[PDB]
Amino acid sequence: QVQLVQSGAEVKKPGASVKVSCKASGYTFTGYYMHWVRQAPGQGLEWMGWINPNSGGTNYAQKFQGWVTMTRDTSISTAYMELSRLRSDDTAVYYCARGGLEPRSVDYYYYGMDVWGQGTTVTVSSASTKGPSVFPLAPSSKSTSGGTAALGCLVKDYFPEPVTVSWNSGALTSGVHTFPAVLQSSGLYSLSSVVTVPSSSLGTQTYICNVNHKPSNTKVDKRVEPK
Amino acid sequence: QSVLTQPPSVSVAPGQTARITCGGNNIGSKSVHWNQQKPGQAPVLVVYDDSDRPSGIPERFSGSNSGNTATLTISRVEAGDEADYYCQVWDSSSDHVVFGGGTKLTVLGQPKGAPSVTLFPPSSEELQANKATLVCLISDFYPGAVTVAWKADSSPVKAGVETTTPSKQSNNKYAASSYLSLTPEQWKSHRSYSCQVTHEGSTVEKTVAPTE
């Protein structure tokens, strides 16, 4: 059961640093090179370098020299990668991946990158943490078509991602469409969650969207009522 | 050094054979490995040493490597093969792994569909906080390309618009959304506002009005 398990998502200001980790299990950590590969959003894989977990020796692609430091702790079979002085265009998912078998030996076999960690998102933004303003999207005659009514919640101007929305504490799940967030030019996000329900059921049933923004320690239950 | 050149997109009908090329100078002399990356996931090694498969990978995935072109070949293409495919070599001048730029495989034949559009006006709660946002939700369209334009009383509004890129829904159609920010005075001073969605040459337009 060969696994690489990376540490959790990180959100940073330009100029800051971050240290991400990659815990290996199910094989002999010191017997394989560890690589790191990043992927900026919507873009291709970019190899960063490798570390030899047996010696600690490293090798960095050119554009990662001088601000990337790969280390390891063999005690706990863990590789680390420290990124120094982040720029906004370092925003990316950062992967560790196990590489060539038996470093510096007659049996050296690089057959690709056969096992990948799950990735660590690193978001670099000058925006500052901020909980959302949650507003009802009231069902009206204009939000109704053919006896079903659409109502929802606007989750406005928050940072960073993610936010989760449920409805009526998890009891209302059919008809729920939570849209992916827009990143506005202010650097803050907005998203909406909408639910289609029987227009005869408004008046008898209460609708509450439950918004959780864990990065700001904020939760909002917003009642959504007809006009 | 080894600069690996892949076509950005390849499309193929179900059951057919997809070929994704990876071009490089004397790539034939290096061992080429191929990773598959499905939306949302970490990459997966699908072919190594030009033609071998890791255990678990179906036999429909094969590759060749000769001269100046390596080729990932996917036989009997299923819709579950939609993914980004990357080739990879190891440069000998500097123990440096080089990736190709990636190839998007789109599997053809999914049914087209015009967008459904729902437009909400500013809530009274927001207006009472001295702000106003119009929300235009766009769903169930395919293919996943759309253009969004906003009007106040039929003249075009270009400031204050924020629109997502489309993204796949669980039913394999796409969704997007667009937001128009304005002041409560701007919202009340016009007779109507419109969100107008263009998809494959045809438009769906929804209107809201402050006094409604």
Numbering used by the authors:
A (entry chain H): 1 to 227
B (entry chain L): 1 to 212
From the publication, what sentences describe this entry?
Previous studies on this lineage showed that HCDR3 rigidification contributed to high-affinity binding to SI06: crystal structures of the unbound, affinity-matured Fabs had the same HCDR3 configurations as those in the antigen-bound state; the UCA and I-2, however, were either disordered or constrained, due to crystal packing, in a binding-incompatible state. To determine whether the mutations Y35N and H35N could stabilize a binding-compatible HCDR3 conformation, we determined X-ray crystal structures of unbound Fabs containing Y35N in the UCA background or Y35N and H35N in the I-2 background and compared them to previously determined structures. These variants were insufficient to rigidify the HCDR3 as observed by the HCDR3 conformation and high B factors or the lack of density corresponding to the HCDR3. Although the UCA with the Y35N mutation confers affinity to MA90-G189E, the HCDR3 is not in the binding conformation and has exceedingly high B factors (bottom left). In particular, the germline residue Y35 in the light chain framework (FWR) 2 is part of a cluster of aromatic residues at the VH-VL interface and makes π-stacking, methionine–aromatic, and hydrogen bonding interactions between LFWR2 and LCDR3, HCDR3, and HFWR4. The somatic mutation Y35N effectively removes these interactions with the HCDR3. Although the loss of the aromatic moiety from tyrosine to asparagine likely has a destabilizing effect, we attribute the observed changes in affinity to the loss of hydrogen bonding between LFWR2 and HCDR3; this is in part because the lineage member CH67, which has similarly broad reactivity, acquires a Y35F mutation upon affinity maturation that is only a removal of a hydroxyl group, preventing the ability to form hydrogen bonding interactions through the side chain. The Y35N mutation effectively removes interactions between the LFWR2 and the HCDR3 at the VH-VL interface and mediates affinity improvement to a more antigenically advanced influenza strain by increasing the association rate.
Specifically, we examine the influence of epistasis on the evolution of a well-characterized RBS-directed bnAb, CH65, which binds and neutralizes diverse H1 strains. The affinity-matured CH65 has 18 mutations throughout the light (VL) and heavy (VH) variable regions, which improve affinity to strains that circulated early in the donor’s life and confer affinity to antigenically drifted strains. The structural changes upon affinity maturation of CH65 and clonally related antibodies have been extensively characterized. This work showed that CH65 primarily matures by preconfiguring the HCDR3 loop into its binding conformation, thereby minimizing the conformational entropic cost of binding. Importantly, none of the 18 somatic mutations are in the HCDR3; rather, key mutations in HCDR1, HCDR2, and LCDR1 result in contacts that stabilize the HCDR3 loop in its binding-compatible conformation.
